[PDB]
Amino acid sequence: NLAPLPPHVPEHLVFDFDMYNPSNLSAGVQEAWAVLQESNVPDLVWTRCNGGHWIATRGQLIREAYEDYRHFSSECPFIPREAGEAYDFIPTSMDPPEQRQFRALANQVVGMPVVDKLENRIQELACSLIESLRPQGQCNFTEDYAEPFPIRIFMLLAGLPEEDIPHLKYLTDQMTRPDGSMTFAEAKEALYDYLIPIIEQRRQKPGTDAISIVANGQVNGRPITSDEAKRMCGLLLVGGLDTVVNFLSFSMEFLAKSPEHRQELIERPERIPAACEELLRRFSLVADGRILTSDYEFHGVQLKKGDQILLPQMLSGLDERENACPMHVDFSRQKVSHTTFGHGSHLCLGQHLARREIIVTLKEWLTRIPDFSIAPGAQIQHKSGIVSGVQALPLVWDPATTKAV
Ligand code: HEM
Ligand SMILES: CC1(C)[C@@H]2CC[C@@]1(C)C(=O)C2
Ligand SMILES: [K+]
Known part of the structure; x- marks a missing residue:
């Protein structure tokens, strides 16, 4: 259903896009979002779906x-x-400014030096x-690789038992693509509730894990509070359980459907990092946003204090004003914006x-299983939300x- 149009929002900017169930979803989720870049769609539209918001x-x-945090605050970043x-x-x-001291801490548990330590x-x-x-000749990629690989790494980093994954994964998914059994707040x-006693335990007896x-x-230079640690650990958990998991499936679906692209990476392994970047553009998958701190005129549109604005990270790279032929995957693309x-x-x-x-996945998969395809008859379905997926x-x-290695 459609929220009544607020008085301040011009009728001619209304485009009722539903970020959790977009009209054109069966053509693929990036495709469905890319309808917002068809001719005759303004740079900034209002949808009356999901309570009403700008896009x-x-x-x-x-x-x-995203650069202007004084007008576009991350205090209320989800629709x-x-x-x-x-x-x-x-x-x-x-x-900012208060955000930064917290980033620095988070960077200590997921930053480059930690990734180098995890590499093996x-x-x-x-x-x-x-x-x-490899010997089975089939798999259910989402459950058999896309989920266990990044998730087990995160659980190792966090010092959490892998048997807790089903519960934590369910909860994280309700925050990004709710099935309707739980609100975000629940x-x-x-x-x-999961984190509070583990945080308490590890403040009493510090280990070396990320929590x-x-x-x-x-x-x-001042001690983090119990409450702050919980709010940071929660985010790390969502990042670990619902980002790369989804991305790997878009990429692998594409590689399954495109022998010529796999062939390129098989004949030319050195290209894998570039291919990673071009897949991250083409199969971009996050869309969150900001809240207006004050009434503000932005690109000729009057925004009102409290208005939410979806600023889809997914869309920048798909915009033909950033990348010519944006729906085309070109591993040789010169400037991948x-x-x-x-x-x-x-x-x-x-x-x-x-x-x-992503790069380890591409290298290792294409080495052992260079040739694969979608199961015959399978109608691949995407799902949309704050993070989209397969x-x-x-x-x-x-x-x-x-090939065995
Ligand atoms: C394909 C994988 C990933 C994508 C596309 C993705 C995307 C994003 C985006 C778009 C933001 C900014 C959101 C905003 O401005 O509101 C963000 C922030 C963040 N990401 Fe990722 N991310 C991915 C992987 C991960 C992983 C694996 C982790 C950690 C386990 C993670 C940790 C974080 C954290 C902690 C922030 C917040 C930084 C801040 O608010 O200052 N991300 N990510
Ligand atoms: C938008 C994100 C991808 C980013 C990290 C996890 C996520 C869902 C957030 O809440 C911030
Ligand atoms: K909030």
Whole structure:
């Protein structure tokens, strides 16, 4: 249903896009969002779906809004309004200047030096999963690799038992793509209920895992509070359980459907990092936003204090004003423009971990299983939300064409 149009919002800017169930979803989720960049769609539209909110449709406006934290605050960064209001993860719910001391701490548990320390385990897990799959000649990619690989790495980093994954994964998914059994506030409450006693335990007896490091950390030289540590750990959990997991499935679906692209990476392994970047542009998948701190005129549109604005990270790289032939995957693309990992002061802290997971996946998979396709008959379905994803990805191949390492 459609929220009544607010008096201040011009009728000619109304485009009722539903970010949790977009009209054109069956053509693929990026395609469905890309309808916002068809001719005759303004740079900034209002949807009456999900309580009503603005959507910036072009990378120029998305970037500008992300840079301007004084007008576009991350205090309420999710749609619908109930979810954005409840949302209190650190650092994402804070604006500069107060945000920064918290980023620095988070960077200590997911930053480059940590990723370098994880490198061998990341490599081993990829190899163990793929080798185990190789003789079978099929898999359900979402459950058999896309989920266990990045998630087990995160649980290792966090010192959390893998048997807790089903519960934590369910809760994280309700925050990004709710099935309707839980509001965002209920899912958050449950994530914090899980975390509170582990945070307390690890402040009493500090270990070397990421929760211990955050919960015993300092921010600008003063001790972090129990409550702050919980709000940061919760975010780390969502990042670990619902980002790369989804991205790997878009990429693998594409590689399954495109022998010529796999062939390029098989003949030319050195291109994998570039291919990773071009897939991160084409299969970009996050869309969150900001709240207006004051009435503000932005690109000839009057925004009112309290208005929410969706600033889809997904859209910048798909905009033909940033990338010619944006729906085409070109691993040789010269200037790969995107905001897949966000933009401005909230630039993704997990991006080095993400790219390492993606590049290790591509290298290891294409080495052992160069030739695969979608299961015959399978109608691949995407799902949309704050993070988009793939419902199921059944793959098949002939074991005879695979290679043991
Ligand atoms: C394909 C993988 C990933 C994508 C596309 C992604 C995307 C994003 C985006 C767009 C933001 C900014 C959101 C905003 O400005 O409101 C962000 C922030 C963040 N990401 Fe990622 N991310 C990914 C992987 C990860 C992983 C694996 C982790 C950690 C386990 C993580 C940790 C974080 C954290 C802690 C922030 C908040 C930084 C801040 O608010 O200052 N990310 N990410
Ligand atoms: C938008 C995000 C991808 C970013 C990290 C996890 C996520 C869902 C957030 O709450 C901030
Ligand atoms: K909030």
